[PDB]
Amino acid sequence: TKEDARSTCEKAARKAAESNDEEVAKQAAKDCLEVAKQAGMPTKEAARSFCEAAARAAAESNDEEVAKIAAKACLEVAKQAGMPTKEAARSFCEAAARAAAESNDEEVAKIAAKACLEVAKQAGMPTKEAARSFCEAAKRAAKESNDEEVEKIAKKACKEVAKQAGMPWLE
């Protein structure tokens, strides 16, 4: 079943984020893909859900290393699933921005920004596009919510990313 696969990929992502050893993350990815294969789920979508879950975890963890681990893990399952890295990184960043928007915490926002940009860095996506994806994802979430208190943390997140990437023109 696909829901099993998604669940497995998310759980695996969290388990990969919690651990600092990479082999654990690689194994987790391999398991995610295996169950995704058994469930008859496309590897791309599996790796996608894995990356989004990983970003979610790295966000909710509120630690700066879990960001890196989640990044490499996302890129790992991406490399494992034959998914493009730009895609992976974009999904990771967007999911990270959303989580950061949902947490409503500037710390988490900084973590998310750093994480996203780190994924981008390791992935080969420009810091600009990554930052832009992040910010725009935040603003998108804020707009979809149709609430200003969300637009606030969204703007804060954008500011954080702007500081991080070092290109003020974002926000």
Q: What is the DSSP string of 68-108?
A: HHHHHHHHHHHHHHT--HHHHHHHHHHHHHHHHHHHT-HHH
| Helical packing angle, 43-61 and 22-38, nearest 10° | 140
Length of the chain: 171
In three-state secondary structure terms, 167 is coil
Question: From the CA atom positions of the chain, what is the Rg in Å?
Answer: 15
Q: Provide the residue type at 162 as one letter.
A: A
Q: What's the DSSP call for residue 104?
A: T
With contact defined as beta carbons under 8 Å apart, do 138 and 157 qualify?
yes
Solving technique for this entry? X-ray
Q: Provide the residue type at 66 as one letter.
A: V
